Ligand binder design. Structure first.
Ligand SMILES: C[C@H]1CCc2nc3ccccc3c(C(=O)O[C@@H](C)C(=O)Nc3ccc(S(N)(=O)=O)cc3)c2C1
Ligand SMILES: [Zn+2]
Length: 288
């Protein structure tokens, strides 16, 4: 039986309205000294709300079922009378957000690497019927080697919330597909839109539809009038056009082929998917 006492707390990694994440090491037994991130949620913050409760369960079920290098690993999960615990792998490589800040613009080959790894994560989730929605730089962490890990499948991580009913829009909404902001119904095609907004951000320095404020930004995303700057490679331009389509069903990846359709695009012509998935490819950025 794994218990909170099995872990020594080393620092606070983050906190919000529902709980905290601690860095921990295992105190005794197997992997005595192995470092983890420990997410601790307060049941009382959650159990009163049918939505947040379902959301919580969904997180654990997803992270329990997922077995994939480019998605954050769930090692143990247990609960006490008042708290839910998730022992996760610790991601030392920080945020991809912190990488875009330094670089400003990624070189094509660097963007291509990350977009490729993310696409395999998305393919993994989608064949499981899971829709990410929240693809954005703050959500993409790196492990110690420098590979991608998708995070944030659970309760809202923000300190400032949008409205009093939902947490769907609390983050930046710059990478979110128009049909979600439209509430016109959506499916896995939103992740391929988001992949495009992220790709655009990597290669231009800012997401494709940003305005002076939030309302102006939403208006731009909805209007969806894409201007591709002339310095983008022919391959990136072509992929960006096909990802950032307002009509969901027309997006690359929206087809029955999903991630395979996107991975087959010339923008990824140099990618060896077998060696990428097996983490044999050297990352452009190396934290340690
Ligand atoms: C998920 C782990 C995985 C490894 C990791 N590894 C980290 C390594 C270094 C620094 C932070 C790490 C975090 C981390 O804590 O991420 C932040 C952004 C975070 O999770 N904030 C947060 C979490 C929960 C809540 S809530 N809903 O309880 O109120 C609010 C804010 C992490 C996070
Ligand atoms: Zn929120």
């Amino acid at each position: 039986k794994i218990r909170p006492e099995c872990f020594e707390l080393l620092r606070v990694l983050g906190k919000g309205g529902y709980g905290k994440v601690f860095q921990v090491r295992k105190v005794t037994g197997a992997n005595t000294g192995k470092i983890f991130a420990m997410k601790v949620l307060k049941k009382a913050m959650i159990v009163r709300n049918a939505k947040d409760t379902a959301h919580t369960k969904a997180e654990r079920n997803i992270l329990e079922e997922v077995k994939h290098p480019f998605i954050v690993d769930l090692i143990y999960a247990f609960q006490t009378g008042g708290k839910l615990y998730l022992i996760l792998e610790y991601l030392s490589g920080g945020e991809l957000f912190m990488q875009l800040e330094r670089e400003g613009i990624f070189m094509e080959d660097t963007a291509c690497f990350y977009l490729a790894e993310i696409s395999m994560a998305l393919g993994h989730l989608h064949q499981k019927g899971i829709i990410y929605r929240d693809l954005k730089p703050e959500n993409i962490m790196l492990n110690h080697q420098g590979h991608v890990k998708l995070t944030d499948f659970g309760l809202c991580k923000e300190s400032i919330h949008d409205g009093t009913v939902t947490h769907t829009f609390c983050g930046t909404i710059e990478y979110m597909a128009p049909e979600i902001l439209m509430r016109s119904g959506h499916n896995r095609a939103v992740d391929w839109w988001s992949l495009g907004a992220l790709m655009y951000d990597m290669l231009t320095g800012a997401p494709p539809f940003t305005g002076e404020n939030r309302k102006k930004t939403i208006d731009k995303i909805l209007k969806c009038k894409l201007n591709l700057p002339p310095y983008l490679t022919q391959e990136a331009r072509d992929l960006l056009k096909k990802l950032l389509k307002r009509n969901a069903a027309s997006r690359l990846g929206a087809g029955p082929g999903d991630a395979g359709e996107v991975q087959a695009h010339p923008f990824f012509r140099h990618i060896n998917w077998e060696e990428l998935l097996a983490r044999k490819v050297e990352p452009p950025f190396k934290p340690l």
